Amino acid sequence: VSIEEFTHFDFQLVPEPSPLDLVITEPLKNHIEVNGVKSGALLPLPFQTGIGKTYTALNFLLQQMLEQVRSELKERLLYYVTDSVDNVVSAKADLLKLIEKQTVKGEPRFTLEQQEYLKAQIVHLPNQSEQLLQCSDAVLNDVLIGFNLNAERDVQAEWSAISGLRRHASNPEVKISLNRQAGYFYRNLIDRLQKKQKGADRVLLSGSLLASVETLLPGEKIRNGSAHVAFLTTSKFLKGFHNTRSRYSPLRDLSGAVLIIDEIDKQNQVILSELCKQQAQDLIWAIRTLRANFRDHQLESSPRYDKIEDLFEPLRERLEEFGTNWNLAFAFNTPVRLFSDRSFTHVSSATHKLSLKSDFLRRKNLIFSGLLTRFVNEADVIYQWFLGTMRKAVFQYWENVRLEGTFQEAVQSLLTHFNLQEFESAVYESFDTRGLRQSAGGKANKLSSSKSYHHTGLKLVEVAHNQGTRDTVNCKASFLNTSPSGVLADMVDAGAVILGISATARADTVIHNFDFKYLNERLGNKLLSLSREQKQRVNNYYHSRRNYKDNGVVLTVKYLNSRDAFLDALLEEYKPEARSSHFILNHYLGIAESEQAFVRSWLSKLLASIKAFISSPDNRYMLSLLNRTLDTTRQNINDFIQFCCDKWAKEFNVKTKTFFGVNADWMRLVGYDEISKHLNTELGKVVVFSTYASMGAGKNPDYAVNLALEGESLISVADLRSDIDSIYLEKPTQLLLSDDYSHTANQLCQFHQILSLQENGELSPKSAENWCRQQLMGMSRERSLQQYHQTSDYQSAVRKYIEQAVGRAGRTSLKRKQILLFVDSGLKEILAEESRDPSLFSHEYVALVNKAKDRAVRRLFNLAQRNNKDGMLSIKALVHRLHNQPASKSDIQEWQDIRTQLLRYPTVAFQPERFNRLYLQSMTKGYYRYQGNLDGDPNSFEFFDRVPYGDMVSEEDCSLATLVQNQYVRPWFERKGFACSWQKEANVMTPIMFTNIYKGALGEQAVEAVLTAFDFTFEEVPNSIYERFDNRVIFAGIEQPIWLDSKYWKHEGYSSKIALVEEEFGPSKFIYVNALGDTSKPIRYLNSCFVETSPQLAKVIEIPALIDDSNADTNRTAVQELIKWLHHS
Amino acid sequence: QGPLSTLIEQISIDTDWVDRSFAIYCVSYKGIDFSERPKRLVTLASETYKSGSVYCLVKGANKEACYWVLLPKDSKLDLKDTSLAIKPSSAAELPTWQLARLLIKAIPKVLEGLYYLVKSKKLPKDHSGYELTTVEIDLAPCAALGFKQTLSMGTKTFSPLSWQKKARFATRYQLDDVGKLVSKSIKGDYIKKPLYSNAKNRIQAIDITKESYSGFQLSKVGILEQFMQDLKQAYGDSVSVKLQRIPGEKHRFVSDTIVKNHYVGLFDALKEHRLVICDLTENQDTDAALTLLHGIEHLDINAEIAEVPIRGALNILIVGNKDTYKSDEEDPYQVYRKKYQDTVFQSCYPERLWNRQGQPNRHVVEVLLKELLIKLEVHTRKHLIEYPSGPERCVYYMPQRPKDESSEVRDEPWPVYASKLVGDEWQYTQATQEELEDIELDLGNDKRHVFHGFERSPVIYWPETGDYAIFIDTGIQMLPEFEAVAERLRELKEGRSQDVPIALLAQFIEENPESKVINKLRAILSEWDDVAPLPFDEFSTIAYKSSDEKQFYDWLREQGFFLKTSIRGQSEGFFNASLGFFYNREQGMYFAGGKGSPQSKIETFSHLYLIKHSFDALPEEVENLFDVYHLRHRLPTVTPYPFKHLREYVEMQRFRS
DNA sequence: ACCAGTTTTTTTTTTTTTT
């Protein structure tokens, strides 16, 4: 068993590729040609289940293994990930079968030695409890003796107890207790082994000890190069797995890894559940500890920590500044709930904006009706800033030492050096997921960056009196730093090649699937897609495998309405010696009045479906998919359903067997094989009552065919097993994700869903903010569902569920000559809206859509409102910060970047990566109408056709054409690259950018050009008074400072500005000038007030119009007057 | 004949048939003192029920402390206690209604009393059984109408015995295997008690939600029809009860238009005054005040929020719930009332401003505004909107209950307040003792209604003639034409049970191409199997509203498919007994119901009110006192508006005492 | 205007890992 076994192997000899194999392979070749090797990519693969999807995935995996072997001979980690453990085990077993049984041209592809070598390269990584319980007592004894750990009495005693329990733990409760004990024992034992291996007593592993350890720790085989293929669940993949040295997190090491994800769309929910688990942190304590410990511990002059202290110096500065400004030394005293998406959404449970004041004599900070929101927002930014710095520091610590054991070593060393051990967990769970962030410089929450919720997350803060000491409060904050789509995008950016294999992998729903609009914008060419030709090839393959029409298989779809009289007659026959069907339903079926109407409707639909099924002569196997389990808790309804089934069986003379509690637990304990056995051995029909959740991926409803019982109804539909031939589809319900790990986890899940809908454009910012507010105050599940049902994302999710069900019901090639699909009439409207390309739809889904017989327009309005609101609030905050001194260094650059972007690209062809919030998709190409008070509520804006007579954003409304026509400003614009005209593209700047920034920037640039044409020159305003005045004017012969301000219509604070400028910079002259206007009105002079005076007594000179808009002539007389007034002193 | 009511016109019992079928006994204690006989009646009945095959027993006249006992024809009463006087009796010796009650109690066995199960609720976890909600049928004398008889249909609940000592020692009721009836049993593991005194179980008076006969059967009136069937089943024609119809003279109806005009007139009068909103709660949820203001805003009334009451303005004081306070000193409402003793203002709790769904409740706001207007009219002692002329020269009086809660308050004299209309101004005063003595003398036998018991009713008095008028709730319930409604519902039930062949729909489309129902029928058929007849549920979207739809449904009826019909049209008049305001001058009875069309689910019966007076013929102006649609919010009232104003005045004077 | 059929939010089951 060695690589030498393949020396004579022919790596060019392969099985005849199927169309699916080509569809997988050739996009990857194209990607490598386009993006090059080690790029990373996401390749959704809408393969229908049952038709060779698992075989093709495993064949691709095996081909990658063979490529690895070939490279090893001539001179990469492979992951198979899915949500379910049993699916992982089945996939691994199928890969082993494929290795053992694959044949090419009539002979086994791999020799027994090659088969053994390949099977040795594959690893399965279950949870720790199962990993321990799978190990034989011999392996554990060998491991304990080899590490001389058996001398430790606690370990030996616990292992003996586990071994004793394992031999007879058949009782489910005893089994659960054994699982918990085994998990804890595995944790302790691996901790001890890692500690022993880290020290100078490192045990040399070889022979039997090495094999035993590898059996106990497959991650050890991964680590030491013995294996490179891992089969594990998504939960284990996110959690990481242990080796002899430390815990290994695949996320931190995805460079070059190939990652096959089965049921890709389902992994969104799993990743969200993992993200929502992270603990709530008390921000006040966190910042207090950070500031105190950064003051306490200062430096160390050692080579290892080179380039580290400079990373934290800004954090030290801002920690001290924040502590001084908010007086963190004082105790905080007066629950209040604050929610924020960190960008444009800020909701609070309090009706009155709470504020913070400091009482020095009391030595306390008092919260009463400095805003509280600003305090927590600043603290959160610092807290995230600290964690982000740790990530950078840990990386740098490696480069100094030179990423898994060294990573934890670096974290521990840095925290000990700075004396911040209390944050070690926060840092670890931050680095695991958020530490994979490749868009670190891609978003600092700046407008100049690429802004999106999916790599911004959300924050939720609870303010309440501290337990044990009510004199103080604690600000417990829980947050998300990314969404599942953000995690996937970071995985692809790290270099992973991801194969998302799932029918409906592009379901077009951000709740039940990754946001593929965001993924497209974020990845570009890295998000691979199947061309029309490849999709046609896949469709042809599917039709060849499922040739319904040529074989005469008829799909009969029947939409069913509530049948009250039919149910009434059935109820009156059940308990015939009764009076009222309402009483029978209430008393005997045990249905309360609050649910009587709903139960009547869905029970009547189900019973109509069953009656139609039993009436049909040939059909034998029916599956009923409800939203609820008809288990013992509903035995009263099961009795009535059984009565109806017996009635109809006697009426139509056909035996019928009902399976009611078909459920995950029932599938585990009784097994779905009972239904298959009954169908294979017993004559008659079968009705199976299950749910969409119970019939999840991997549950195979096939049954072995016995032609004696099938009559002549079966027909082979391919160019011995059969599947469901009748199905009832209840409308999927409860389509909003929920988390039961904890209350805060559920809150994070709900807010993530709301913000994802707002980001996708499915909710207007007004509706999104209202929903966030209602959620914060504690709205009911039913009201959340009502809010969700208004979006088209809900309909997309419902269609996804229906498609998944019908696809999962069609796993064989033997079909009955008629297939009965019964559908709740509530699905008719939803399915009639299906408008996607039907090339990859299954026959059942196509029939469903035909029998029924997310608007980009809606998204455009919502996204225009969202971008305008984000721009408005971001610019307001940025200007407010610019009116503060210390933050000027970065905010000035942000301001200049925004202005330069708008001047240079007023309109762009493609959705920008950066500055994406500066623009909206106009729907009118280069212009658009809008209404809204830019100084008022951003939620009130309306755009495009909704306001035909509203204000317009266009090249005409800014007078750029009249400005850059025959003047000195055109050379200025051409030299600096500014746009002399608006290209008529789809993306146009938002109203806020047009009105508050672009039009002022044009005036500033025009004034600068015109004045520089007359020997003037300018320098940047000092940070103390930045953005209060445009520029500082320098002219020969004048020593007094001169300030310029180009703003129209006073866009009384001018006197305050003048006083503030003069008190610092002494006496000065001020220039007020409008770039465009008319020369007809005289120049004016003023003295720190709107009242004018004589020229020499005035310090403020107003030039009403530097340029005549009628023909763009330069008002040279005004310039000469200005020069004379300057020289007069 | 007029609207139907629970008042019994006649009870027909064949006393000879009863004697041929049952044996009756009279029982009373012999020799025991009347002070101790109550102490042994605790056992008397149980001993009688332990004696043998006793069907049931019914109390006689209270003065006798006796019982009438019913046993089979061949059985004989045998009580081991010799201290009891026993006497075989003939059925003819009993009052007809008492024998009827005995027979009713015996229906469960022939086929404490007769209970029909209507609705059950499963108990919470850790418990088994049902909470049974039943309709009890029993006769009761009508004290207001000379001991005429009424047929009660009260709701009464049963719970498992398993779910105090008194609860353990109660009639161990039992439910039937069929579940049609609930009857007393020795070890029947059921007690006639709900979970709390709260969450009172109720049963709809009528229910025709979807013209569903089965849902109609589960209302009080459906149970009444079933009881009328069971009476004939048990006794055929030998026993029968006929419900009396109130003779109809005048039956005013009330459309939404009239009420809307009245309320726009009302709101306009309030637009001329200043309104203020206050909040005296500790944890001030100012959102309550904001919601109140916004609700008032939708009515276009100038309102504002102030931190304290303002004299001379219409102030609404949002105050904390009284249940959170242990004494009047802790209540801000009473504290401010004691201070602001000469200003009109209203109060309400913050929670009432939103409905169960959380939406703002506008009925609360409108009721607050109407109460403010009424209080302002009392304060200014002049009408601000048009009130129809009342009787001339009359004086209104209203006894007020003292604050004491002891049982002796039943007989204590009470303070009495009076109001009078002179010209246009309303005079309000506290009645002098001489006036009260004169009124008591004049009322004669009716004085007990005004000066005895806790139920002291206001009285209209005519000093110039001594005439009076008292408005008494008789307790009689007005019933719709439930026999006819039940017949129609059964006809619809039979018709809707048959699926309509597609042939008839095609024939209709052929025959009436101009009909606009065809646009719907073609779509329905295209979305249906050409081989299967259409069940009625497919046509449900085709409402019985337009003329063409009515013609289509009538045409289907001629084919034998009776699917939809008119039930609540005024021509039918089934629901007259629960609509508008009905009044009869000659006999002085009246009742009030709803406005507009009857809602499909009516939860209550309008009571019949009796005006007791001394006139040979009641003055016509008395009718005018009820044409007021804001005393009872947006509905006809059963109380004269002068009494509403006088009650408001009496309430205002509480803090001036 | 008036008079009589229509009418009312949503509607769970399931999973993995580490403690």
Add this chain to the structure above:
DNA sequence: TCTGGACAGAATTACTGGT
């Protein structure tokens, strides 16, 4: 074990379209 009379609790204070 009957029974009726207080005494708080519960529902109702529509909606909408066709004529």
Add this chain to the structure above:
DNA sequence: TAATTCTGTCCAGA
């Protein structure tokens, strides 16, 4: 201290 009207428990009393 939403108001009115109807009504379900409940308890003492005859």
